Structures are given as structure tokens and as C-alpha cells.
Design a protein around this nucleic acid. Structure first.
Lengths: 206, 98, 442
RNA sequence: AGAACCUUACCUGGUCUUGACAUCCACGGAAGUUUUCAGAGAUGAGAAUGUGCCUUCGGGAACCGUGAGACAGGUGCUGCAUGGCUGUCGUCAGCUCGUGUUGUGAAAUGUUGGGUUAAGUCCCGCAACGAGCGCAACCCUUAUCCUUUGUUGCCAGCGGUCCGGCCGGGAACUCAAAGGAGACUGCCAGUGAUAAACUGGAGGAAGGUGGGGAUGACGUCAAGUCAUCAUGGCCCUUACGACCAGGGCUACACACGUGCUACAAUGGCGCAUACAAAGAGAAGCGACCUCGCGAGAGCAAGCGGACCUCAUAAAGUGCGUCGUAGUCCGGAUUGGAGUCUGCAACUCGACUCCAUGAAGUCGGAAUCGCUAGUAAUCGUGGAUCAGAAUGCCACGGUGAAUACGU
């Protein structure tokens, strides 16, 4: 392992921060722990809601959480009912009054993290990984990605010895910082161990 | 007289934030000192990357606290009612000292 | 319950309609029962549909009233809120817009007095209301002139003017009109504001000569309007120009401003000089007072006035390109507006060339609307027009309006059309006369 | 990125069994506060008071206490079952694919050939035509100027000077941080396939990826981590789980690794004096003043900090002395007296003072780093941290030698 994280190096250039708020050294730590403590619940409770990305703002003793999902009708629910149920619980965790803004994710197979979470599912649904990575790679090309590289590793399909597989189509300029690369990871907990998933998606040069 | 201290982690975020304050203050009472650029405290941090060994390889991140100053020197208390309605972005800290 | 055959009864208890009922197949939205019985689950035996409007007037001792979203509305001049009623916690009415001000008298009295009177955002025929809006209007133009917001006293002092002289009966807008009917028989002038809006500031010495309401240019007179809101699209000393008078307007001497910004103008002009040039005139405001202490407006143009006197005091020459007008704030730039007889704005800008470059067609149609005579002809071969007018001058109410008629060639004949500047009149005279000659020549 | 207890997983001993940590059920009390006895320690016993919410008059929420079973727990094994992350060849310039062609085929051609470059970098040729992962650039810092603004930052031109930017003041300058400009073989001469390119010059603060950094391809080592975490399987579940006290991780006939301090006169000691950058500070940085030889102590400003504090930089220079003496070099070791932190400084801290002054007089075979603001040398700050660095990371000062050459 020698490649650097592409989202981390692209933070000051083209990829926005996953959380933007200010704190001095007194409350910086408890800001981070509470920023974590909101994050498992939103991924656990809304695992069926196909959540892609979560952003936190802290505007002067409040919290604004931006949930990016491809199926907003699940998290909002029937007749606008479940967001308010989600409203007090994050305030219960954070201790401050907060407001959550639902951000819809149109064009869903062009987001790496939702691609990573969707490609997580069928491996623990025990279908073949060869067809799975193939399905996740042509539709990005079909619906207009400019480059996609995916990766799996570790006990594929019941293999007793770990093997790594990667499919790449298009262009993935990982060494170009101004290029816009979409990348996030996910894991699948099969009966044999841990399937690893890495997926890079490139869309634009600036 | 009235000192507005503005601190943020981003220079591309604080410039409009200090523009919103200095334009609204000059709009309804005028006479505002220029938005002062002030030296940035850079917290450079050394972290080991590997879980177990190889000390010699490390990562290098840093925190850049972009700090700005805006001064109001004259009594212009018509602004001080509507200036609280600005509700600026979350990435910029503001401190007021009189 | 919505799309579910359990029935959220009183409190958190849930029961159902009995299977032996006639209406067991169609459970209604609001059903009541006679007997509650505990069994494998809870049920109601004798069920029947009621309208949810019936229950509330018979349960006056049982309703829990709730009020949320207290917001003041202009449409009734009072505080509005959505009401919620509950019997043992049962939402008889989920939401209903109600008048929150009519319910409680305490907090809305301070709200109504501040909004409808101090801000004065009312649509009423009250005698005090028309004068009080004007009284707040005659001090805001002073602050739009003096460019300082310290003269006008705060609105809380205006709030205490209304509150200490109103009776305690007024808690809403409806109580005020009843109060205003009795009270105005005695003291109409009590609610009208006094002239104590200026106290001490030292900026109240606003002189009418240094802030004139009119600008003179030859035989013309240009209306001056004022506004103090920096960074706006239309800030600065604004001139109101009649559209037929446009042809007599010239841009020279327009940039001298009123004397209230002349000290501030030339500071920015010296500031507009580059740093090697700027260092000569140190400090810039001190050089301005010596400059303004020796020059008068319109004796020289603005660019030439600064160059000669700065060389007079120093001896180092300044070129015409050393002065930058973009670095001058836009409020120092005079806003240019053209007006009709009803002050309807057609075009606006910050130079006279921001007007004349787009109004030429409409100025021509302004000329032709007044010109109801057959000077403009078409299909002409030989000079039959007599002594042709060198300049066509008309009158529209107070002001004159000038033009210059000339001939027009049409490749088959000669026409006559009006022109608004003597030079292209001569050009159109030249092409017309030559074409008229060779038609006149056999 | 910091073992006195804690950390701590080890050992001995004393203790617990739905458990130190979760969720569900049932019952009681709100919580909590204070006091005493015993025990090295977790128990047992009192006194004060709990009791705020929510009107649907009831219950619920937070918490504590007890019992049961589902269950928890493990720094236990397997890195040769794994994810994630890392070192490595190596910042080496290389590594592949679609179509076509050749060959029965494994495969080749592209990618070889002539130059050229730091570079499959670029030009030409070419059964290859193109493309992708890499190279470079785009990213950060530094080297110059201009625009904006000017505090707590600066003082050129003014004035008063309390001689101190101190003040009034001035925004010029340093600087601060935002915006731009600039360096691209751009221009010229020669060479070269009329090419790529190379060599020299002009101009310029910088000239041939200007300097440094970040960035590391396909993969190798069944490389290292089950002890950061997650994790499949196996193992204990009255114990390989859990609590506490004390000891151990700091031992010592030895050997190796990496550093620090010296063997001295380019030096030591004393006196006097000049020149920095960078960073940290609220359970904190901690001025001044007083006490003590000193570690520090008391007192107590300002400071969430371009203001206040850490905080006098030192090698450097000028004086006097030492004079080649195991020495006025070197400080180890040892004894006594103390200071601070912390329940506690015995094992097992750091520092001060007094007394002592081991070895060492330039180091065998062999071996290491460094191509310029580098090596060498002199100091400073920071992470961890209650207390603790000669280590690590970062910042400045002085400042080289040499590269014929393969």
C-alpha cells in the first residue's frame, strides 16, 4: 500500500470539505466526537435510504446536517413524517438544536460511495463478483462517466487465498490534482471474511 | 472603537464574510476601517502513517487559521440593530470587543 | 389511523369497531362508541360516524387549546397563529389559522404599536397617520443629504411616543380604530409627531446652498434628488432631466457635484494618482482645502482644474491619464436619469452618454409627436419647401425643445426628416441637396 | 508523540460470577450529599435531604439498587484465511489494452530503429493505427515587482519631544494576506534530418524539471500489523473474563545498533557587548516586585494573545588569565543538603548547591553521511506531557572542501 488517498489530497483544490465549522482548541475535540456520534446513526438507520454523503455545519450553537441520498422518498417517508422523527435524535446526540437538509442525488450510479455501498450488497447476497463489477462499470460508461476504476480484494467467492481484482474503463488521472475524482470505500461482511471495495470515478478536468 | 475580529479556516470563505459585514456597516452609517489582513496561525501536525512500524514514513497536514480584523471607530448605532441579522456562514468565527 | 384498521381512541388507548356492526366493513374517519370492553384486544360495540365539528362546542370544559407560530399579519393588522384543540390529547382540529392578538392582550399591544404606527406600514385614512409618515420622511432626506445616520432619533423613542399617549384599551388594530374615533374628537394633534427629531449632533447644520435641490446649466434647470445608500446601483446625487430638454444638455461641468462632496471628490482623484505621483501631494486632504480655497466651479473642466492648480502649488506636471475614475466610488458619480412629465423612468445610468446612446429613437419620436406639421415629406424632386428651417424649435409646457430638420435621400427621390445634432443635419443636407440638384438638373 | 501508581496487556496475593462495559424483563427508591468504624483494597452502618416533569391525574424521563435468562467479555490463536494501512525495489521509468497484421501455437508487432531528454519526453522512420496507468504540468512553500487595506504591525517626510514611534500624525517603507504580473527555449547566434534538440549570449530577481516539498504505475517479498480498528474460523465462559494492593516492563559475567559528551589553545574560564527565525499558551502562558548562592517560593499584572508571556539566543567581537601540565580540558561516579510535580520520587523522575574528579591524550580490521546555504558547528521552539528528552519534528545563525573524470 503506497497510493495516497485521492479525496484527502484534493481537499484544497476541487473536493469540498466533508465538514466546515470553526472551533478553538477547547471545543475542537468534542466537536469531532459529536461529529462522529451523529454519523453512525445516520448510516445505520438510513442504510436502506441509500445515503451517499453527509456534511456538517455548526452555525453559532446550531448544527446543519446535509444528507445526500438517491432515494429521498424513503428518508422523508410517507406524507412527510420521518424527518421530524430524525430531527430531535441528532439534537439529543449533539445537545444543540439542529436542522437537517435532505439533498437529493440524481444520477445515482455516478457517485462512488453509493456505488461502493451498492456493490457491497450483492457480494453478501452471494452472486458472482465478476458480473457485479461488470454491471457497476458499464452503466457509468453508458450514462456518461469520463472514467471509472473499481477494486475488490480478499477471499473472492470462497477462495482460500486472497486475490485482488480491478476493472478500469476510461481515464483515471489520479496524479492530476485539478481533475475531479470521486472515491470512497465500503466493506462487505460475507461468511468467509471481509470483502474490500475501492472505487474511483473521474468526471471533469477542473 | 468597535472591533470585529473574524477568524476562519478558509481564505476563500472569509473574504465574502468580511465583505458582507463591511458593506452592510458602510451602507447604514459608513466610516469603516479597511478589512485588516492579520498573520495566519499555522498548526502543522506530524502523524505516523503505519499502524505498527516504519517511523521514517509520515504524513504532514496543517491547520491554516485565516484571521481578519474590521474596525469601526465612530458611533453608528443604527447599524448595530440590523447587523445582528447578517447570520453569516458557519466556517467563520466573529468576536466583538468594544 | 391512516390506511390502518386500528383506531386511535382517547388517550393512547387503541380499539376497533366490532365485527358484528353494520359499519364494520366501512370504518369512518370519526367514529364514536358506547361501550369499551377488554378482550383479546380492545373493541367498541355500537359504532357510528360523527362530524368532528360537533364535538368541540359540547366539550368546552374538555378542550386543551394550543397556539403555535405567532406571526403578525398586515392583512388584519394583528398577530396570527395556528390553533390546535385537544380533548384528552385528541386533535379535533389539526391546524386552524386564528387571530393570536384577539386572544391575549398583553404582548400584542407592544407589537401592534411598534409595527402599524412606528414603522407606519398601514393603509388607513387616519389624519395623524398621513402627517407622521411625512414627518419621518422629512428627516430621512436630511440624512440622505448629510450622509450621516445620527440625526434621526431611534424608533423606540417613537415607540414611547405612541405608547405613552395611547390608552390601555388598544391591544390590536380593531381596538385602535374604536379608540381613534373617541380620541380624535378632542386631540387630533396629540398622535402627530413633534419636531424633536433633531437634538444635538452637529450634523444638523445642513445648508440648503451646499445641498441644493436644483442644478442649473445654461437656460436649463435640472432637478436634484438625493440618496445615501452606498454600494447601490442608483446611489449618489441624481439628476432628473426632461426628455425633450435632452438636446440642450451638455456634459461639461457636470462632474463638479454639489459643494457637499467636492472636498471628498478631489481626495479620491488625488488617491487615483499612482504612488510616485501621489507622494508629491502629501497629505491629500490638506492639498484639497488649498485647492478648494482658490478655484470656483465651471471656470475650467474637472480634469483641467486639478492639473493646473496642483502644478501651481508644487511645480510637477500631471498628465490627463494619471487620474482614474474607476477608483472613484460610484456614489461620487452622478446618477443620470431621464424623466417624462409624470416622473416615470425610462433609462438610467451614471453618465450623459449612458443616456444619449440609447434614447435617439425615442427622442426623435418625442420630436415628431410635438411636430404635427408637414415639414417632413417624402417623394420630393424639386425644391418647393420655401425657406427651409435651419433649426426646428418647439415648446412643450414649461420647456422648449430643439431639433434640426434636413433632407433624406431614398434612391428614388428626396425626403425630409428631423435630426437632433447640427452636424448630421449638415450631412443629411449635403446628400439631400446633391440628390435634389441632379433631379433638378435635366 | 514520552512505564513512580495509573498506562500495564506480566507476576504474586486478596477478591467477583448475567459480570468492570451493553440491550431486553420484573420490583424498589428520584438523583445525589455528608459522617464513622474494619480492611492493603472492593464491603457492611448511619444522618440530611431527594421527589425537578405532566395534566390525559395518571404515568413517563434521567439515575441508582436487586434477581433471572437470552447474553456480554478476551491486548486469546491463526497477518499462511482477510479488509484497511505501511515498508520495500524506487520517484526506477517503465507497465498494459481495443482494433489490425504475423505466427498452428505459446507470443510478437504498438513498446523496436536514427537522434534527443531528468523522463516509451519529443521529432523522423516504421504493420501498425490509436488509447490507458505512469513522466511533466495543474497543488504547497521560497526567490522579484505591482493593486487593495493598514490594526496590536512600520517611521520616510513633518511638528513636540519626557530622547522612547514616545505623542500628535503620516501612510511612504518593512511587513501582514488577498488579488494579479513574472520564467514559457520567450528572443538572438552556431550545430543539427529544413526535425526533436543541444551549446553560448542578450534581457531579467530567478534560464533551461530556478530551489525544496507533496505526488509513486503494473506488481515483488504468502514482508509487517488479528495488539489501533473491523473481521471468518477455533478456543475459555465459576475464567485465557472482571476489581484492587504491591512488584516487573528500569535486572546484568556480557555482545551489537543509534546517538549524546569529551580527549582541548581555531580552546577553557570570567567580564562587557551586537545580530535571528519559527512555534505554544486558559484545569494555561505566566510580566514586574520581594526572599534565597540556586533550583525555586511568595505576591500577583496582562494575555484565547502581530499587543501579554514563554524569552537574556549562542557560536560571534573586545579585554584579562591559563599554557601544554590527565592541566583552570573532561565531566562520569559517589556522599551530604535541598527545590518542583504528583496520594506517593525506595526500586523508579527532573533540577539546584556543596564535596569528588573514573576513563579519555583522536581510536584495529572495517565502516557512514554529504554535490551548496549542502556538510560541519552554534542555539531556539513544538507534539507527547501533572512531573518528566542526548530521541523525534520544526526554526534560525555562522558557514565550507571537492567533482579531473568513468
Amino acid at each position: 500500500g503506497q497510493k495516497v488517498h485521492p479525496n484527502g489530497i484534493r481537499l484544497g483544490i476541487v473536493k469540498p470539505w466533508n465538514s466546515t465549522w470553526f472551533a478553538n482548541t477547547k471545543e475542537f475535540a468534542d466537536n469531532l466526537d459529536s461529529d462522529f456520534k451523529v454519523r453512525q446513526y445516520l448510516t445505520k438507520e438510513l442504510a436502506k435510504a441509500s445515503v451517499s454523503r453527509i456534511v456538517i455545519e455548526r452555525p453559532a450553537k446550531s448544527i446543519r446536517v446535509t444528507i445526500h441520498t438517491a432515494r429521498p422518498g424513503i428518508v422523508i417517508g410517507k406524507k412527510g413524517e420521518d424527518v421530524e422523527k430524525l430531527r430531535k435524535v441528532v439534537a439529543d446526540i449533539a445537545g444543540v438544536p439542529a436542522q437537517i437538509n435532505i439533498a437529493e442525488v440524481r444520477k445515482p450510479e455516478l457517485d462512488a460511495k453509493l456505488v461502493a455501498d451498492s456493490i457491497t450488497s450483492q457480494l453478501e447476497r452471494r452472486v458472482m463478483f465478476r458480473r457485479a463489477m461488470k454491471r457497476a462499470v458499464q452503466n457509468a460508461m453508458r450514462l456518461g462517466a469520463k472514467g471509472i476504476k473499481v477494486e475488490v480484494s480478499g477471499r473472492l467467492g470462497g477462495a482460500e487465498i486472497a486475490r485482488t481484482e480491478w476493472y478500469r474503463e476510461g481515464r483515471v488521472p489520479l496524479h492530476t490534482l485539478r481533475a475531479d475524482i470521486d472515491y470512497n470505500t465500503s466493506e462487505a461482511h460475507t461468511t468467509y471474511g471481509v470483502i474490500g471495495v475501492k472505487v474511483w470515478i473521474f468526471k471533469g478536468e477542473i | 472603537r468597535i472591533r470585529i475580529r473574524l477568524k476562519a479556516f478558509d481564505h476563500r470563505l472569509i473574504d465574502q464574510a468580511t465583505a458582507e459585514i463591511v458593506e452592510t456597516a458602510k451602507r447604514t452609517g459608513a466610516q469603516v476601517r479597511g478589512p485588516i489582513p492579520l498573520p495566519t496561525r499555522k498548526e502543522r501536525f506530524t502523524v505516523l502513517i503505519s499502524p505498527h512500524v516504519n517511523k521514517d514514513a509520515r504524513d504532514q497536514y496543517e491547520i491554516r487559521t485565516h484571521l481578519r480584523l474590521v474596525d469601526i471607530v465612530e458611533p453608528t448605532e443604527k447599524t448595530v440593530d440590523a447587523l445582528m441579522r447578517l447570520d453569516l456562514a458557519a466556517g467563520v468565527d466573529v468576536q466583538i470587543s468594544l | 389511523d391512516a390506511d390502518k384498521q386500528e383506531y386511535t381512541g382517547a388517550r393512547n388507548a387503541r380499539f376497533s369497531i366490532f365485527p358484528g356492526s353494520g359499519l364494520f366493513k366501512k370504518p369512518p374517519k370519526w367514529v364514536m362508541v358506547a361501550e369499551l370492553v377488554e378482550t383479546s384486544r380492545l373493541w367498541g360495540r355500537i359504532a357510528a360516524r360523527i362530524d368532528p365539528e360537533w364535538v368541540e362546542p359540547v366539550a368546552q370544559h374538555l378542550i386543551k387549546r394550543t397556539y403555535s407560530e405567532p406571526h403578525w399579519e398586515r392583512a388584519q393588522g394583528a398577530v396570527m397563529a395556528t390553533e390546535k384543540v385537544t380533548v384528552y390529547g385528541l386533535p379535533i382540529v389539526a391546524a386552524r389559522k386564528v387571530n393570536y392578538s384577539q386572544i391575549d392582550p398583553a404582548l400584542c399591544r407592544e407589537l401592534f404599536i411598534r409595527h402599524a404606527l412606528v414603522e407606519g406600514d398601514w393603509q388607513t385614512r387616519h389624519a395623524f397617520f398621513r402627517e407622521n409618515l411625512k414627518l419621518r420622511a422629512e428627516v430621512e432626506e436630511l440624512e440622505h443629504k448629510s450622509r450621516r445616520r445620527d440625526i434621526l432619533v431611534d424608533d423606540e423613542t417613537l415607540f414611547e411616543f405612541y405608547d405613552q399617549r395611547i390608552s390601555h384599551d388598544v391591544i390590536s388594530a380593531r381596538h385602535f380604530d374604536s379608540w381613534w374615533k373617541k380620541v380624535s374628537r378632542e386631540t387630533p394633534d396629540l398622535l402627530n409627531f413633534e419636531k424633536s427629531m433633531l437634538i444635538k449632533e452637529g450634523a444638523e447644520k445642513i445648508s440648503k446652498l451646499d445641498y441644493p435641490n436644483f442644478w442649473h446649466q445654461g437656460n436649463l434647470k435640472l432637478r436634484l434628488s438625493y440618496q445615501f445608500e452606498p454600494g447601490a446601483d442608483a446611489d449618489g446625487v441624481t439628476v432628473h432631466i426632461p426628455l425633450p430638454l435632452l438636446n440642450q444638455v451638455e456634459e461639461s461641468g457636470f462632474e463638479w457635484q454639489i459643494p457637499g462632496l467636492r472636498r471628498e471628490l478631489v481626495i479620491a482623484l488625488i488617491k487615483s494618482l499612482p504612488k510616485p505621483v501621489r507622494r508629491n501631494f502629501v497629505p491629500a486632504p490638506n492639498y484639497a482645502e488649498a485647492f478648494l480655497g482658490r478655484v470656483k466651479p465651471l471656470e475650467l473642466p474637472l480634469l483641467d482644474s486639478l492639473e493646473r492648480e496642483l502644478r501651481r502649488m508644487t511645480g510637477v506636471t500631471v498628465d490627463r491619464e494619471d487620474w482614474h475614475w474607476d477608483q472613484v466610488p460610484d456614489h461620487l458619480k452622478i446618477t443620470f436619469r431621464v424623466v417624462d412629465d409624470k416622473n416615470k423612468k425610462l433609462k438610467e445610468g451614471r453618465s450623459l452618454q449612458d443616456l444619449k446612446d440609447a434614447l435617439k429613437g425615442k427622442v426623435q419620436e418625442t420630436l415628431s409627436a410635438v411636430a404635427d406639421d408637414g415639414i417632413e415629406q417624402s417623394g420630393l424632386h424639386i425644391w418647393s419647401f420655401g425657406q427651409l428651417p435651419e433649426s426646428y424649435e418647439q415648446k412643450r409646457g414649461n420647456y422648449k425643445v430643439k431639433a434640426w430638420p434636413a433632407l433624406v435621400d431614398e434612391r428614388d427621390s428626396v425626403a425630409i426628416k428631423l435630426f437632433d445634432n447640427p452636424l448630421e443635419q449638415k450631412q443629411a443636407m449635403w446628400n439631400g441637396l446633391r440628390r435634389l440638384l441632379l433631379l433638378n438638373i435635366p
